Design an enzyme around this catalytic site. Sequence first.
Site, short mmCIF file in Angstrom:
data_model
loop_
_atom_site.label_atom_id
_atom_site.label_comp_id
_atom_site.label_asym_id
_atom_site.label_seq_id
_atom_site.Cartn_x
_atom_site.Cartn_y
_atom_site.Cartn_z
N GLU A 1 15.68 -9.59 33.43
CA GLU A 1 15.17 -9.41 31.98
C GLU A 1 16.21 -8.50 31.12
O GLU A 1 16.24 -8.67 29.74
CB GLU A 1 14.01 -8.60 31.71
CG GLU A 1 12.71 -9.24 32.51
CD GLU A 1 12.32 -10.41 31.66
OE1 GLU A 1 11.46 -11.01 32.35
OE2 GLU A 1 12.52 -10.61 30.32
N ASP B 1 13.60 -12.86 22.72
CA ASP B 1 13.68 -13.59 24.26
C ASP B 1 14.02 -15.03 24.12
O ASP B 1 14.29 -15.45 23.26
CB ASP B 1 12.39 -13.26 24.94
CG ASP B 1 11.61 -14.09 24.81
OD1 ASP B 1 11.13 -14.75 23.79
OD2 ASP B 1 10.79 -14.51 25.74
N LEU C 1 6.84 -7.69 25.79
CA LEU C 1 6.73 -8.73 24.78
C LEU C 1 6.06 -7.85 23.63
O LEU C 1 5.09 -7.12 24.13
CB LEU C 1 5.65 -9.84 25.24
CG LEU C 1 5.04 -10.69 24.45
CD1 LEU C 1 6.23 -11.48 23.22
CD2 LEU C 1 3.91 -11.49 24.78
N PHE D 1 5.01 -11.72 35.52
CA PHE D 1 5.74 -10.77 34.55
C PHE D 1 6.31 -11.76 33.43
O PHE D 1 6.24 -11.48 32.00
CB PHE D 1 7.02 -9.77 34.94
CG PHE D 1 7.54 -8.83 34.24
CD1 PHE D 1 8.45 -9.28 33.17
CD2 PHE D 1 7.00 -7.54 34.27
CE1 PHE D 1 8.91 -8.12 32.26
CE2 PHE D 1 7.68 -6.35 33.49
CZ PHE D 1 8.49 -6.91 32.53
N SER E 1 1.72 -25.58 43.77
CA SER E 1 2.80 -24.51 43.97
C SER E 1 2.29 -23.43 45.00
O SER E 1 2.68 -23.01 46.12
CB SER E 1 3.57 -23.98 42.93
OG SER E 1 4.04 -24.94 42.14
N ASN F 1 8.58 -28.09 44.67
CA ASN F 1 7.56 -28.15 43.78
C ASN F 1 7.44 -27.22 42.50
O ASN F 1 7.27 -27.54 41.31
CB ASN F 1 6.03 -28.10 44.51
CG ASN F 1 4.96 -28.11 43.38
OD1 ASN F 1 4.26 -27.38 42.84
ND2 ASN F 1 4.58 -29.58 43.29
#
Length: 164
Positions: A11, A20, A32, A104, A117, A132
């Site tokens: 990040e 972002d 965020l 996250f 998945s 996948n």
Amino acid sequence: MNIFEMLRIDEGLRLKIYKDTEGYYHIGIGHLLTKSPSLNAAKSELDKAIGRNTNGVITKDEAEKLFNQDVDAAVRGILRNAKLKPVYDSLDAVRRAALINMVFQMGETGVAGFTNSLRMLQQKRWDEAAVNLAKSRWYNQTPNRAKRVITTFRTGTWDAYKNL
Ligand SMILES: [Cl-]
Ligand SMILES: [Cl-]
Ligand SMILES: [Cl-]
Ligand SMILES: [Cl-]
Ligand SMILES: [Cl-]
Ligand code: NA
Ligand code: NA
Ligand code: NA
């Protein structure tokens, strides 16, 4: 290496409001603020999050405080979710960090949508899961980060985050 260091790599750290890779307002280590295009809305959100009337700039300690909350919240998202909790339970601690990373970035509801998945991860079919996971908007839009997370699931090692 651990989940905090991993997400700090993925990040970054910015002390002023930034957009972002989705074009949304953020601060700190991928925190965020809002999906609204209004910068004023983002700054109110920031002030609300920090507890003071900022000037759109926070300190490193403040950024780390929000990050610590956000990591905690991603686990809460996993453990309260009927789809995510059994997969997490089934994983080793390194792969657990990869799942936290995804939540996250994308949130609980979005990672729970990776039904096939998640099944392959619960089955410990690591190479199949990795194939996948890459068939996704996630991988196409953030390929180098998704490749790191996927390697972490595939191998159960930190090799994608060493040398960085
Ligand atoms: Cl918050
Ligand atoms: Cl819970
Ligand atoms: Cl649920
Ligand atoms: Cl597949
Ligand atoms: Cl990327
Ligand atoms: Na970033
Ligand atoms: Na704007
Ligand atoms: Na985030």
